[PDB]
């Protein structure tokens, strides 16, 4: 049985070896550090690979999924901002997909910087937070969108579509159908800008690090993997990619946290299923 328990067992099985091989160790040489003092990692356990680092002072990745390329970070820390900020800009950010919970922003005990859904300045940067549309995803699931428009002397003004979903509580997983009707937006708004900086004869085309749809939770591993997961099969060119990939490239890209629970590794299970997608390699 493809699908089978045996199946999914040895999924799980393959993930769990793996996600313990990736464990960071002090000083882990396969992970980006923090610069003598301040706090890199919001979770000194979730930490970033070196590798595929974004920025050398951000817990973030770029992340390729067989031909699905995006990237994935933790939640920006206060200090962290100007450098997302600046990233997001220079990625020329097509969306930003941010799937942390408005309880846990709200929650000043968790240190997550209302960094999206209002105007403000981080230093050299103004920002603006324009809320454009809501939509609903199934099962009371809500997208709610901006347009964050990252101003900066002397830096080109470049505002990102941002999708955000307030009702997804961390550490959980979402109707694949919900799941799946999010990855549908996330691209279509994606696709929508993307198409903007092509027609505008962007040059960020050409640099394959860029237009980068950003993805993150918190810590940027959990519900963040699921999107991505749900992303890349919904990549029309990802054709025989496995699951057992999906999670084993993410986690050499990232760590091997991504797809941190298992109802999340499920709903790909499930929306690979109806795909007729392998679960494991042969
Ligand atoms: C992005 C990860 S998450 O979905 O926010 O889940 C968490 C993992 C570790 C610690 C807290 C939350």
């Not at 994935?72 to 941010?98: D, G, K, W």
């Not at 050299?124 to 939509?135: A, L, P």
Request: glycine fraction near 6%.
């Amino acid at each position: 049985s493809p699908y089978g328990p045996e199946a999914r067992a040895e999924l799980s099985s393959r993930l769990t070896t793996l996600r313990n091989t990736l464990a960071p160790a002090t000083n882990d040489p396969r992970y980006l550090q923090a610069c003598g003092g301040e706090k890199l990692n919001r979770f000194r356990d979730i930490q970033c690979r070196r590798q595929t680092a974004v920025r050398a002072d951000l817990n973030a990745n770029y992340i390729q999924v067989g031909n699905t390329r995006t990237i994935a970070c933790q939640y920006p820390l206060q200090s962290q901002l100007e450098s997302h900020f600046r990233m997001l800009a220079e990625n020329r950010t097509p969306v930003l997909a941010v799937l942390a919970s408005s309880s846990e922003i709200a929650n000043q005990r968790f240190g997550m910087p209302d960094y999206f859904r209002q105007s403000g300045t981080y230093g050299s940067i103004t920002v603006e937070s324009k809320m454009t549309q809501q939509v609903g995803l199934g099962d009371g699931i809500m997208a709610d969108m901006y347009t964050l428009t990252i101003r900066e002397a002397g830096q080109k003004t470049i505002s990102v579509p941002v999708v955000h979903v307030g009702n997804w509580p961390a550490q959980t997983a979402v109707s694949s159908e919900v799941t799946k009707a999010l990855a549908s937006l996330v691209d279509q708004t994606a696709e929508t800008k993307r198409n903007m900086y092509e027609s505008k004869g962007s040059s960020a085309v050409a640099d394959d690090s860029k237009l980068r749809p950003v993805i993150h939770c918190r810590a940027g591993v959990g519900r963040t993997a699921q999107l991505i997961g749900a992303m890349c099969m919904n990549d029309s060119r990802n054709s025989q990619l496995s699951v057992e990939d999906m999670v084993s490239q993410m986690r050499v890209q990232r760590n091997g946290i991504m797809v941190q629970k298992d109802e999340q590794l499920d709903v790909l299970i499930k929306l690979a299923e109806g795909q007729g997608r392998p679960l494991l390699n042969s």
